[PDB]
């Protein structure tokens, strides 16, 4: 499981690459059933929307549901991630952002790396985000939007907002881009939203500027994201580290697994 | 009969409930309309609706009564030719609004049909009207375009009662008549979501019973959407109570005469 040379160049130049149809419909069935089961588990890893009606984000489902553990070790994910980072990898973060039909809320414009750098002592952006679509992603159900190529700017420096939106994780709003920055950046780094059927995979750079809008549609948008990190790039927090459900601590190199998810 | 829709365009309107005419107005004409909009946004009065956060204008009514170029627009054969063709009658302005959905958080518009609001609020007898959208901004997937449930006007009016309380006392916000999640879930299989997208100066005609709505605009680009509702002169509202203000519901049923030529 490998990227084509064009796909590697696309990731380098644009900051994201889309692999359609990586997981088959029956594997999507098994994953969605495990998502529905996992959403019922109470705990601090389960983040509700502000309006309280539905789950907004779930952390560390791979520690509770076997299929998500299998997914996280799949060579269909680790092959591409290893090709891009050229190192041994471990799971820095595992989340599913479950954006409900009929009002699932937005995700603020941000970069990921600065959050992990400043909150957790992540030294360098030697990591890759690997999205797995558990819903068809369309123009209508709040797809991730990227500022194309904006990871080439590196980290856009800022201080965290005075008050945190959530005490269960860092909501990107805490490190949100300002309007002035977005207006300047979008002219050089235009908006693009990769669209594809469920089971598709989207790899994207931790310094790409990205965000997503509220989902007004009748269709849910369940988006799984695994952040793989270089084992030699473990966080060095100055204080007590955040919980393991949000920030991984086991830097044992992952060994990939071939075959279907079951 | 100058500005005539083709058979294909009429068929699209009849079957799908909307049709997009790209590039109807030039960049120069769009610029004049955008300058008029910036001026009109500053006019104080009840025709000016603010977003819930008060930070920007959400909607303006009756700009054609204050800005010459919007009066010219409302009489242009590029809008009245198609409207007259679709309705086959003399027309007057039922409603004139500009929904100015600002960059960086301009708010959504609830899923709804237009006709039932006018039927129940104003005594509009029948859906013998057409909505004419004019794009004063480029409309993309990113700046909260109108989304239609394609073909849903063929269901006629989906009956409901207005919400006990109104969101606004300056106009009827569509949320007062919003579609239920159950309705939308059931209907979208047969009437899928579609969003006309096009450069500023394009025109979008749509039926007053099509289900439609729009999302918040998280992008750095504004989305200024002008909508003129033309009504059959024989289909004037017959209100049972005191009529709403003229800035929101037109009363002068004198047939409009279309004009050719550039806006200035
Ligand atoms: O789920 C989304 O739309 C994006 C959220 C995101 O960027 C993140 O959680 O880092
Ligand atoms: O501006 C929009 O997105 C649509 C609002 C609408 O449908 C209306 O005002 O009737
Ligand atoms: C910007 C996001 C990737 C941050 C994430 N929610 C965290 O708490 O680590
Ligand atoms: C549904 C909308 C077309 C109603 C409009 N805002 C009015 O007050 O008439
Ligand atoms: Co992010
Ligand atoms: Co409407
Ligand atoms: Na004209």
Residue numbers in the entry:
A (entry chain A): 1 to 262
B (entry chain B): -1 to 262
Paper text:
Like LdoA and EcdK, GriE belongs to the 2OG-Fe(ii) oxygenase superfamily, whose members couple the decarboxylation of α-ketoglutarate to substrate oxygenation/hydroxylation via an oxo-ferryl intermediate. Recombinant GriH purified from S. lividans TK24 lacked the characteristic fluorescence of the expected F420 co-factor but nevertheless led to 4-MePro in a coupled assay with GriF, indicating that GriH can use NADH directly without requiring F420. Together, these experiments suggest that 4-MePro biosynthesis starts with the GriE-mediated hydroxylation of l-leucine, followed by oxidation with GriF. The crystal structures of the leucine hydroxylase GriE have been determined in complex with substrates and products, providing insight into the stereospecificity of the reaction.
The canonical iron-binding motif is formed by His110, Asp112 and His210 and has lost the metal in the apo structure. The crystal structure obtained by co-crystallization with Co2+ and substrates unambiguously revealed bound metal and both l-leucine and α-ketoglutarate. Co2+ is coordinated by the iron-binding motif and by α-ketoglutarate as a bi-dentate ligand through its C-1 carboxylate and C-2 keto group (6A and S9†). The axial position trans to His110, the expected binding site of oxygen, remains vacant. l-Leucine does not coordinate to the metal ion but is tightly bound via its carboxy and amino groups. Its side chain is not involved in the interactions and adopts a conformation that corresponds to the most probable rotamer. The coordination site trans to His110 remains vacant. This crystal structure should thus correspond to the substrate complex prior to the binding of dioxygen to the unoccupied coordination site of Fe(ii). In the GriE/substrate complex, both the Cδ methyl groups of l-leucine are located at a 4.4 Å distance to the metal. The reactive oxygen atom should be coordinated to the metal in a distance of approx. 1.6 Å.19–21 With respect to this position, the pro-S group would be closer to the reactive oxygen atom (3.0 Å) than the other Cδ methyl group (3.3 Å), explaining the exclusive formation of (2S,4R)-5-hydroxyleucine.
